[PDB]
C-alpha cells in the first residue's frame, strides 16, 4: 500500500509538493486517494521582548507545522520506484512508510 506522510512549515510550499508527488505516481502508475490534510501543530512561544525588566512586554511567536498524507492502496512497481530518488522540494520533509 505505502502510506506517504509529509510535513512542512509553509502552507503554500507543501501544496505543490503534495501535488507533484501525487502526479508523479497517479499518472506514471495509477491509484491515489488524495491529499489527506490532518491537524496542524502550532508550537507557540512567549518570550520577553526586553533585555532587562518589563515583564508585561512580550512577543508571542508560533511555527505552524502543516501535515499531509497521500495513501496509495496497491504496491505498484512504477509508483514505488518513482517515490524514491525523485522527491526534491526543499523545506518539505517526507517519510514513506510501507
Amino acid at each position: 500500500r505505502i502510506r506517504i506522510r509529509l510535513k512542512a512549515f509553509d502552507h503554500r510550499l507543501i501544496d505543490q509538493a503534495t501535488a507533484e508527488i501525487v502526479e508523479t505516481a497517479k499518472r506514471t502508475g495509477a491509484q491515489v486517494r488524495g491529499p489527506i490534510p490532518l491537524p496542524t501543530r502550532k508550537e507557540r512561544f512567549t518570550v520577553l521582548i526586553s533585555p532587562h525588566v518589563n515583564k508585561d512586554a512580550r512577543d508571542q511567536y508560533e511555527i505552524r507545522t502543516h501535515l499531509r498524507l497521500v495513501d496509495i492502496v496497491e504496491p505498484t512497481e512504477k509508483t514505488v520506484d518513482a517515490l524514491m530518488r525523485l522527491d526534491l522540494a526543499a523545506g518539505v520533509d517526507v517519510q514513506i512508510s510501507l
Binding site: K7, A8, F9, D87, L88, A89, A90, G91, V92, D93
Partner: protein, 206 residues
C-alpha cells in the same frame, strides 16, 4: 524604543524567510546553530564582496546556501576559484555537503543592507554623516525607489552628547503589511563609539 521589526511582521505575508528548511524538534536546535555559524563566517569573510542576504536550504542532508550580492565577480574571483574555497570551509562547520549559488543584484542602492553598509563604511573614513546619509537618500530615489527612510543614531561628528537624525524622501508606510519594505541595520565602529544606521526602502505596494 517601540517599533516592530519591519521584516519580522511581514515574514508570512510579503517577505520570505531566509532560512528555508524543515526539521524535527530534536535536530532543530543544532540545525539552527550551524545555520548561524556559516552566516556569521560568510558575512565576515566576504566583506568587500558586498553581500545583502544569505538564503539557506536543507533538502535531505544537503546545505544549499545562496548569496545575494551586488558584486558577483569578487565572490567568484577567477574561474570560480573562491566558490570552491568557500564550498570546502563552509561544508566542514555546517553538515557534510555544500551547494553555494550566487544571485546578482543590478540595483545595489535599493537593497537596505548595502545602503547601510555604504553609510557605515563612509562613517569609518571620517566622512560627514549628513554627506553620507543624504547622498544615499538622493542616489536611490533617482534609480527607482518610492520611500528610503534613513536613521543614524550615536555620537556622530565626535559629539559629546548622542543624537539620532533621519532624512526620508517619499512614502514609507511601516504599518502597511501589504507594502514591501526592505529594512536593515548596521553598526559603524568609529573612534568615538558605535553609530547605528537603520534604513527602510519602500519599493512596491504589494
Amino acid at each position: 524604543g517601540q517599533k516592530v521589526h519591519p521584516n519580522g511582521i511581514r515574514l508570512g505575508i510579503v517577505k520570505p524567510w531566509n532560512s528555508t528548511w524543515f526539521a524535527n524538534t530534536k535536530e532543530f536546535a543544532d540545525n539552527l546553530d550551524s545555520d548561524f555559524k556559516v552566516r556569521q563566517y560568510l558575512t565576515k569573510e566576504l566583506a568587500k564582496a558586498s553581500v545583502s542576504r544569505i538564503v539557506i536550504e536543507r533538502p535531505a542532508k544537503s546545505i544549499r546556501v545562496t548569496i545575494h550580492t551586488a558584486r558577483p565577480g569578487i565572490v567568484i574571483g577567477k574561474k570560480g576559484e573562491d566558490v570552491e574555497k568557500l564550498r570546502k570551509v563552509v561544508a566542514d562547520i555546517a553538515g557534510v555537503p555544500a551547494q553555494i549559488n550566487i544571485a546578482e543584484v543590478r540595483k545595489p542602492e535599493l537593497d537596505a543592507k548595502l545602503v547601510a553598509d555604504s553609510i557605515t563604511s563612509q562613517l569609518e573614513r571620517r566622512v560627514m554623516f549628513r554627506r553620507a546619509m543624504k547622498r544615499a537618500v538622493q542616489n536611490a530615489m533617482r534609480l527607482g525607489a518610492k520611500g528610503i527612510k534613513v536613521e543614524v543614531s550615536g555620537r556622530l561628528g565626535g559629539a559629546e552628547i548622542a543624537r539620532t537624525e533621519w532624512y526620508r524622501e517619499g512614502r514609507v508606510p511601516l504599518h502597511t503589511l501589504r507594502a514591501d519594505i526592505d529594512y536593515n541595520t548596521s553598526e559603524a565602529h568609529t573612534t568615538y563609539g558605535v553609530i547605528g544606521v537603520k534604513v527602510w526602502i519602500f519599493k512596491g505596494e504589494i
